[PDB]
Amino acid sequence: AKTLLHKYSDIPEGTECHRKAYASTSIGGATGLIVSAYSIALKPPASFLEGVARTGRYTFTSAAIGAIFGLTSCISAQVREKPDDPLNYFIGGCAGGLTLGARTRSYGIGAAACAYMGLTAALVKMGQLEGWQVFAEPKV
Amino acid sequence: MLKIIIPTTMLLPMTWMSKHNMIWINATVHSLLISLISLSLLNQLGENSLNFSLTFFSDSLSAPLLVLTTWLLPLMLMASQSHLSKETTTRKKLYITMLILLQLFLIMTFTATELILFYILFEATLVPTLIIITRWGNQTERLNAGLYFLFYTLAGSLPLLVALVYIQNTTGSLNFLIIHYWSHPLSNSWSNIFMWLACIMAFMVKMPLYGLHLWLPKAHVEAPIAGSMVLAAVLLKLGGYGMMRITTILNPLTNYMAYPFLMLSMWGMIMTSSICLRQTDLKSLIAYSSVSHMALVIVAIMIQTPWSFMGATALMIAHGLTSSMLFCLANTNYERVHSRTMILARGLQTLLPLMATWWLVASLTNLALPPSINLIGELFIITASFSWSNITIILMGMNMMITALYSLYMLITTQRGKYTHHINNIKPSFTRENALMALHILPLLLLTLNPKMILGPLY
Amino acid sequence: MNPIIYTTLIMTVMSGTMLVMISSHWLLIWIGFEMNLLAMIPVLMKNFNPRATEAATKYFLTQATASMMLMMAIIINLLYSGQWTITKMFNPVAMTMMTMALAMKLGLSPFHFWVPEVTQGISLQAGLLLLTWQKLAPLSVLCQISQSINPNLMLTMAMLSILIGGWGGLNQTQLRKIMAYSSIAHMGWMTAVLPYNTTMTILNLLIYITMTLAMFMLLIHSSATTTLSLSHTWNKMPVITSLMMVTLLSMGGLPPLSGFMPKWMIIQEMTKNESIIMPTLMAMTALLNLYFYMRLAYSSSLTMFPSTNNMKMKWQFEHTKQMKLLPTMIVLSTLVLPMTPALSSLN
Amino acid sequence: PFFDVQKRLGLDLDRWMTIQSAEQPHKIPGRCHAFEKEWIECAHGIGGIRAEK
Amino acid sequence: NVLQIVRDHWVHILVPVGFVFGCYLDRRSDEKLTAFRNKSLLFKRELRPNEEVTWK
Amino acid sequence: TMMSGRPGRVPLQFLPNEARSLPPPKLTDPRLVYMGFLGYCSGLIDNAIRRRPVVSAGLHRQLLYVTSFVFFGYYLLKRQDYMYALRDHDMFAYVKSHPEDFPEKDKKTYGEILEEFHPVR
Amino acid sequence: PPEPTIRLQEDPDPEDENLYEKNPDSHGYDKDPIVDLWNMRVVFFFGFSIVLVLGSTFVAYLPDYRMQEWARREAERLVKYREANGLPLMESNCFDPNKIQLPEDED
Amino acid sequence: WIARTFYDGPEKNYEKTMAILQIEAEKAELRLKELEVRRLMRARGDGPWYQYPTIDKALIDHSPKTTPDN
Amino acid sequence: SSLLDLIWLETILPKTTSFIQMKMSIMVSNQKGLIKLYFLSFLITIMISMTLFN
Ligand SMILES: CCCCCCCCCCCCCCCCCC(=O)OC[C@H](COP(=O)([O-])OCC(O)COP(=O)([O-])OC[C@@H](COC(=O)CCCCCCCCCCCCCCCCC)OC(=O)CCCCCCCCCCCCCCCCC)OC(=O)CCCCCCCCCCCCCCCCC
Numbered sequence A: 001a002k003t004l005l006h007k008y009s010d011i012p013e014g015t016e017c018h019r020k021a022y023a024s025t026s027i028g029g030a031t032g033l034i035v036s037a038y039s040i041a042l043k044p045p046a047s048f049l050e051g052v053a054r055t056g057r058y059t060f061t062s063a064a065i066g067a068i069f070g071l072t073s074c075i076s077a078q079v080r081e082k083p084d085d086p087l088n089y090f091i092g093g094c095a096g097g098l099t100l101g102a103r104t105r106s107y108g109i110g111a112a113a114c115a116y117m118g119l120t121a122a123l124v125k126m127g128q129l130e131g132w133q134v135f136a137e138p139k140v
Numbered sequence B: 001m002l003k004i005i006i007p008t009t010m011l012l013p014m015t016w017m018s019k020h021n022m023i024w025i026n027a028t029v030h031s032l033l034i035s036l037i038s039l040s041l042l043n044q045l046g047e048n049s050l051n052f053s054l055t056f057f058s059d060s061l062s063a064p065l066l067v068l069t070t071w072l073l074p075l076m077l078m079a080s081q082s083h084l085s086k087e088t089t090t091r092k093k094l095y096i097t098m099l100i101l102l103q104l105f106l107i108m109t110f111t112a113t114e115l116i117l118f119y120i121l122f123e124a125t126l127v128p129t130l131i132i133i134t135r136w137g138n139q140t141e142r143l144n145a146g147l148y149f150l151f152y153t154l155a156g157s158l159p160l161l162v163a164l165v166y167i168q169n170t171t172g173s174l175n176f177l178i179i180h181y182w183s184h185p186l187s188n189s190w191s192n193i194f195m196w197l198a199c200i201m202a203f204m205v206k207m208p209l210y211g212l213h214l215w216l217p218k219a220h221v222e223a224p225i226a227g228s229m230v231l232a233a234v235l236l237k238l239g240g241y242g243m244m245r246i247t248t249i250l251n252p253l254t255n256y257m258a259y260p261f262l263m264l265s266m267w268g269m270i271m272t273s274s275i276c277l278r279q280t281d282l283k284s285l286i287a288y289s290s291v292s293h294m295a296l297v298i299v300a301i302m303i304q305t306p307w308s309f310m311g312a313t314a315l316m317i318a319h320g321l322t323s324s325m326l327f328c329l330a331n332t333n334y335e336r337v338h339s340r341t342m343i344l345a346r347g348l349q350t351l352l353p354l355m356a357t358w359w360l361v362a363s364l365t366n367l368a369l370p371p372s373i374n375l376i377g378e379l380f381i382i383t384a385s386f387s388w389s390n391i392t393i394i395l396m397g398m399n400m401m402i403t404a405l406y407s408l409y410m411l412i413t414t415q416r417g418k419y420t421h422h423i424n425n426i427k428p429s430f431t432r433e434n435a436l437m438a439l440h441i442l443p444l445l446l447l448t449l450n451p452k453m454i455l456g457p458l459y
Numbered sequence C: 001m002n003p004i005i006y007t008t009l010i011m012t013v014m015s016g017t018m019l020v021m022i023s024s025h026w027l028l029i030w031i032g033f034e035m036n037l038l039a040m041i042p043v044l045m046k047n048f049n050p051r052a053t054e055a056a057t058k059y060f061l062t063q064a065t066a067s068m069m070l071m072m073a074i075i076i077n078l079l080y081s082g083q084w085t086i087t088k089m090f091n092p093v094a095m096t097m098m099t100m101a102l103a104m105k106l107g108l109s110p111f112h113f114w115v116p117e118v119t120q121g122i123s124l125q126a127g128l129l130l131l132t133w134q135k136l137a138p139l140s141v142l143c144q145i146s147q148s149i150n151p152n153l154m155l156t157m158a159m160l161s162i163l164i165g166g167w168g169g170l171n172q173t174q175l176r177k178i179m180a181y182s183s184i185a186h187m188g189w190m191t192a193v194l195p196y197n198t199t200m201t202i203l204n205l206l207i208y209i210t211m212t213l214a215m216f217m218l219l220i221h222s223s224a225t226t227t228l229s230l231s232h233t234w235n236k237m238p239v240i241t242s243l244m245m246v247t248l249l250s251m252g253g254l255p256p257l258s259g260f261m262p263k264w265m266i267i268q269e270m271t272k273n274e275s276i277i278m279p280t281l282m283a284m285t286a287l288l289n290l291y292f293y294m295r296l297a298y299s300s301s302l303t304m305f306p307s308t309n310n311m312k313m314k315w316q317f318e319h320t321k322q323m324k325l326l327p328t329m330i331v332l333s334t335l336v337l338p339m340t341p342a343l344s345s346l347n
Numbered sequence D: 001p002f003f004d005v006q007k008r009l010g011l012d013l014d015r016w017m018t019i020q021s022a023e024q025p026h027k028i029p030g031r032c033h034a035f036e037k038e039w040i041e042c043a044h045g046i047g048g049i050r051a052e053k
Numbered sequence E: 001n002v003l004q005i006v007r008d009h010w011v012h013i014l015v016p017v018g019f020v021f022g023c024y025l026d027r028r029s030d031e032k033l034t035a036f037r038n039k040s041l042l043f044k045r046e047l048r049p050n051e052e053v054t055w056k
Numbered sequence F: 001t002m003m004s005g006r007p008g009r010v011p012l013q014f015l016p017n018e019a020r021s022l023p024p025p026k027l028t029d030p031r032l033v034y035m036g037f038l039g040y041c042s043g044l045i046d047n048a049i050r051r052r053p054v055v056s057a058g059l060h061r062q063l064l065y066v067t068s069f070v071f072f073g074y075y076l077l078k079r080q081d082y083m084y085a086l087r088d089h090d091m092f093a094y095v096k097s098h099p100e101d102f103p104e105k106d107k108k109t110y111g112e113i114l115e116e117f118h119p120v121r
Numbered sequence G: 001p002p003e004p005t006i007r008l009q010e011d012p013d014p015e016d017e018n019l020y021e022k023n024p025d026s027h028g029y030d031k032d033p034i035v036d037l038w039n040m041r042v043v044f045f046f047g048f049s050i051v052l053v054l055g056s057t058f059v060a061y062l063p064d065y066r067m068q069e070w071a072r073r074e075a076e077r078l079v080k081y082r083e084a085n086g087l088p089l090m091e092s093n094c095f096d097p098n099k100i101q102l103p104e105d106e107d
Numbered sequence H: 001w002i003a004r005t006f007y008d009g010p011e012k013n014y015e016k017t018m019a020i021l022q023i024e025a026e027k028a029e030l031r032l033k034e035l036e037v038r039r040l041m042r043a044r045g046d047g048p049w050y051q052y053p054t055i056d057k058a059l060i061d062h063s064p065k066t067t068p069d070n
Numbered sequence I: 001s002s003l004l005d006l007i008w009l010e011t012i013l014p015k016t017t018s019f020i021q022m023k024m025s026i027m028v029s030n031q032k033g034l035i036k037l038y039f040l041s042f043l044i045t046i047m048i049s050m051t052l053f054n
């Protein structure tokens, strides 16, 4: 729900890193839990224990991604003293991509993931700054 | 403008109601007459434009491209007459229909007072070219080539459409005259940066830009001769024409946003000219030479100075003619040797002296020998770049040197030396091929007498 | 079956759709849906085989679950306001129940799983009926209550449908599954403009129905249900393959073909509402549909595949039965772009 | 979509059953009939947006 | 021979006819853009005694 | 612009009475000519599918194709023109009835408007 | 392994046919000598004779719609006027400053 | 001779451009006004457009209802 | 000619797109045809939809 969205967004971007990391970790974990539920539904692998293991691995991976993104992005914003900069978000995305690569132990996916995640993060920051609407209300 | 559009449309029923052995003659004669009629668009004004109606308008940037488009069809028919001999009447009529439809779409694209109409026709040109490449190409790679030539284009062109409609939702119009008269500066914003990118990338991919040029060697190598001619001569210039039209709304953001594309073009011209030095295929070498010339045109358009625009127009026309001639020469060799490997058939001067003269003159125009219009455009762009920054001279001179090197390498490898002994099927050159070569080359040396016809609207 | 019984069942399906379209009472709309479902099953099981029975039972399970969800939405809406008229819902929960029921009836993602399997199981004429006529009633109901829908949910399902159709069509050799994934993508395109303009929804529906009718009638004429079977058609009916290639190009959204009209217009409409990112993603994803349409065109008409010796006998015979509206469908699906402003007719 | 055949023909196929205060048999009165009548008379012809606000 | 080569050369006449039709249509479209004829500040001209329109 | 609920709209009329106050399209309308061309194309494709001489197989059938397409196109053009006329009429009436939402801009000449100049160097 | 190694029934690849073989003076247009000769004649007449020569002469004698001599004469009389009156040739202002209203800063 | 037999004077193209520009500018301002009018009508609902149906009041029965209090 | 033009420029834009679309298509279209999994996903999506929006 939007409760986690508000919990993340309410914290100022350039301050108070640990709560930002906590919120991003929770959001990532919720996303991973939804992904695990869908994966269990569509592909029941063999049994209960392997299924709960797969849920654990997906949730921990997504939570680690969110934690690293939030921590790195907030630390970059704090040290650079320049809030409202998409570069900080891009760095966070790159950090998140690196963490994902480590989990999958692939140099290519880690590199590929880092570049793509960073770009996505930069775009989200630009949308926050400029007021871009993903889901626009009917205006006209 | 209908006095040119209607005859081009009438080319279709005339082609489909023709005798089985009169299609080439009738198509060639009436396409030549259409070219002659279109030649009267060259009487341009020093003032605004030739505004025929609400839908079509002519400009001294559009008129040379229109005349070259009309002139290219008879040459394409003459080049296609040979390798389509063993094919049924219905399929040859379909091939001529594809060529006529391509000409019609290009003609309507170059006038196209509306930006959405320009986009629609500029994307409608895609279908005939794809069918020609993937139907009448020889090798098995043609399908793959077609896919590239498709998706690259759309990958650039789909964002543009969005940008276009967005502009009309804010400005209220997409008419080029209203856009030019009511133009306003673009503020340095992320939204404006992405609008700039959406406006530019579609035309950048079809120049092509150096990083985005992968589709061109495949598409030009696997296409039949008419397809290669139309791809190199007219279809590459759509990006330049679109950029020249659309950069009027992108100021002053072009000053900052031009840097990555300027660096890409200035380094990629060197890269592609160097690639030409090590090439085992004639068509691939000619394609990479086209990439280098269009990189120079991209630099010219990005600098956006009067001399830049004049040089870019002149270079677009000259490159179209020269590349079409070079592809025709390569195809004349190929239809004899069936290999398309440059090192295989050697010493063709001793067996085909007049064709060797044609090769020499084509290499000379590709080499940008003065006072050809190739060098006129080259020098205007180079001077504009020098005014932009004095350090561009190193890259420009290096490109000139490498261009001369690979042009003369291509000439020496194929024409000089000793003939290959085991090749004994090199027949004397036909009157059709010599006529095709002359009809390519005389317009160039005759345009060098009246350069203002191809120097664009800023002359 | 008996032609009388077949005609009766077809008119009962059409009368159910009509009942849904002309009524103002929620009970009568539900009754029309029930009538349509009841008369649709034997049409899917007209030719008896285990696959058709499986397709019919899957279709029945899906549609009956959707009908029960729709009646639940109706009763909740009645509970929170004693109204039976189809208009704005007045209840947030009821609207969601209604939206999911109609998404399940239409086949929108994530309720898309039944469409490819049902289309593959049934014959080509049944598939034509299922993919053309069975979208009118749910879309009409959606248009009637478009002011109620949460844009977030509808747009999420639309984008999901476009993505799923594009990705799922890439992996198919069967023509019916390709048509099913194409229909899923086109439904995704249709439902993304409901929150903003129902006229664009209807225009997209009409264009899609025209193209789907042309493509199915071409597939029935050249009786092929696989890629390799269709690859033999050039050796008997090359003109059919040429028409099919042009229709496939139109279905991929290339200008100046008719298939470019909806997306363009839809994109244009979505730009008037300050929605930029979503149309961009929709077009980029439609490139996938274009890719597998182009692969089909490569395999069918742009290259000549090997044939067999028995094909010679087929050279001596001509079709006994013909579709009267096939040429009109082809022309309307390829060459109506110049007549775009006629969309003001509120089609 | 909605083809209002009843309004064009004056049929009244299902409008008798849509609201509480519409001519019940034996003049039986709905529990919320007074409230519904007032709401309907307030919102008649005004349009959905203005009726809601 | 007349009535014989016509059946073999009828197609040739079509392109020329199209050119004439396009010229006629261009003039007809010109006739719909006369809202400012002899009204521009640059070419406000007083009509000749035996003149109807400055340009056609 | 959703006009489904527009007041005084008879449900299933293709053309209302007030549409008769608009000029009917000319028979030489380019859109009508395109409709006839579409009918001719349909006739040719019908000939081709049936393996008949495409240009000269059925002249009665091709004539019927052209005529039906022209007929429907004429009525469709009438309805389209009527709907666009209604859109313009409603727009103008709304602007007239709400002057406070469309205030007049003060006409200002370029002589006293300061536009920032950006050199091209 | 009784397989034929013949993967399918295929026509052999035909050898290319020389137009000079059945017809010297072949012009490379068609294998029919009459159609070949007339194709050569129409290409040469409508390409070299009509378009290339007459079109080039037409372009050479195009009227001055660009107004090069007009601008030269205007500049000539304008320079004659300003030199006679001692005016400083070209002015640095493109528009008259009296008719421009600058915004007062009051900084 | 060429100018006399193939072309026209500058007045024709000049005034045609004037007319074309005038038409296109009117179309642009009409489009902008139309967008603003649509926004206002959809926001307030007091116009002819975006009129959503409400219950018809002719369906109400105004009669004694077996109970004085309705 | 080789490192950039034939390898890395191919690897970046076209080959990456082809690989990603290939993998996504494989993941999307690989369902065994068991309606148990389908309706389990239906319950999941329905449950998620009600909670997130309201
Ligand atoms: C921009 C707008 C302006 C231009 C409009 C463009 C469209 C206009 C026409 C639209 C459709 C109408 C015709 C379609 C029916 C098909 C007919 C046909 O098959 O051709 C055979 C037929 C001749 O053959 P036949 O001896 O009678 O019978 C043998 C079989 O029919 C055939 O023998 P077969 O079956 O044994 O041969 C097999 C062959 C046969 O298969 C085919 O050729 C089928 C034809 C393609 C289907 C077209 C789809 C629907 C049209 C949409 C076009 C989209 C355009 C948008 C741009 C994208 C381009 C794709 O199939 C193949 O070879 C397959 C491989 C081919 C490569 C891939 C196919 C590429 C398709 C793209 C074609 C697009 C242009 C087509 C032009 C018209 C073609 C006739 O052609 C014709 O004669 C009809 C041409 C039109 C007649 C014009 C009459 C007017 C002249 C006198 C009045 C003058 C008017 C001016 C008034 C003022 C005078 C004073």
Ligand SMILES: CCCCCCCCCCCCCCCCC[C@@H](O)O[C@H](CO[C@H](O)CCCCCCCCCCCCCCC)COP(=O)(O)OCC[N+](C)(C)C
Pocket: B035, B039, B064, B067, B068, B071, B317, B443, B446, B447, B449, B450, G051, G052, G055, G056, G057, G059, G060, G061, G062
């Ligand atoms: C074989 C050996 C040689 C034998 C032959 C010897 C004779 C050689 C002489 C010819 C070449 C020598 C050069 C001398 C040039 C003399 C003619 C020249 O001066 O006239 C030019 C005139 O020619 C034209 O300017 C150039 C021709 C235009 C070319 C159009 C191309 C034809 C259409 C083909 C299709 C288009 C394909 C390409 C698309 C872009 C320039 O004149 P200009 O001072 O300026 O004004 C003309 C006269 N005015 C003053 C009344 C106005």
Ligand SMILES: CCCCCCCCCCCCCCCCC[C@@H](O)O[C@H](CO[C@H](O)CCCCCCCCCCCCCCC)COP(=O)(O)OCC[N+](C)(C)C
Pocket: A085, A086, A087, A090, A119, A122, B188, B189, B190, B193, B209, B210, B211, B212, B257, B260, B261
């Ligand atoms: C591959 C073959 C060729 C394809 C085409 C290549 C051409 C595309 C290049 C795009 C042009 C430039 C894009 C952005 C230019 C903005 C200027 C920026 O570079 O400078 C700094 C921008 O700072 C940082 O760049 C912030 C963004 C950081 C995130 C970007 C990702 C970095 C690498 C991504 C490259 C990948 C390109 C391909 C994507 C698929 C200045 O910071 P600041 O003065 O404060 O803000 C200026 C912008 N304002 C004024 C609107 C606010």
Ligand SMILES: CCCCCCCCCCCCCCCCC[C@@H](O)O[C@H](CO[C@H](O)CCCCCCCCCCCCCCC)COP(=O)(O)OCC[N+](C)(C)C
Pocket: C199, C202, C203, C206, C207, C210, C332, C333, C336, C339, C340, C341, C342, C343, C345, C346, C347, D001, D002, D003, D004, F004, F010, F011, F012, F013, F014, F076
């Ligand atoms: C791709 C081509 C599709 C063509 C469609 C099929 C053509 C054959 C149809 C045969 C004739 C149809 C006319 C029907 C007669 C009476 C019409 C009347 O009953 O309906 C009116 C309206 O009729 C239709 O709206 C007009 C249909 C015309 C469709 C053409 C527009 C398609 C877009 C342009 C593409 C080019 C097509 C032209 C070439 C043939 C009033 O409708 P209304 O009860 O008040 O509200 C319902 C609609 N709402 C809900 C959206 C408001």
Ligand SMILES: CCCCCCCCCCCCCCCCC[C@@H](O)O[C@H](CO[C@H](O)CCCCCCCCCCCCCCC)COP(=O)(O)OCC[N+](C)(C)C
Pocket: B003, B036, B037, B038, B039, B040, E023, G050, G054, G055, G057, G058, H004, H005, H006, H007, H008
């Ligand atoms: C030295 C003297 C000759 C100089 C060279 C002149 C040669 C000119 C050739 C090139 C012409 C270019 C195009 C000019 C025509 C443009 C189209 C149109 O505008 O022209 C129309 C006239 O065009 C002619 O009727 C047709 C010209 C066709 C030329 C064909 C030449 C080649 C034919 C070869 C046939 C050979 C016989 C067959 C052998 C097999 C009249 O225009 P119009 O709409 O009024 O203009 C409005 C303004 N007005 C009213 C003041 C005029």
Ligand SMILES: CCCCCCCC/C=C\CCCCCCCC(=O)O[C@H](COC(=O)CCCCCCC/C=C/CCCCCCCC)COP(=O)(O)OCCN
Pocket: A119, A123, A130, A131, A132, A133, B152, B155, B156, B159, B162, B163, B166, B190, B191, B192, B194, B195, B196, B197, B198, B201, B205, B212, C274, C275, C276, C277, C280
């Ligand atoms: C050869 C393959 C190349 C593929 C395409 C490359 C071009 C990419 C350009 C961007 C694509 C979409 C841009 C949107 C089109 C213009 C519309 C516009 O300018 O509106 C902007 C909207 O701006 C955006 O929404 C941009 C979002 C972009 C999302 C998609 C990102 C695609 C990849 C991004 C990284 C790469 C960017 C450059 C790539 C160049 C090609 C290699 C502002 O409008 P509002 O938001 O309503 O007003 C501001 C107040 N609210």
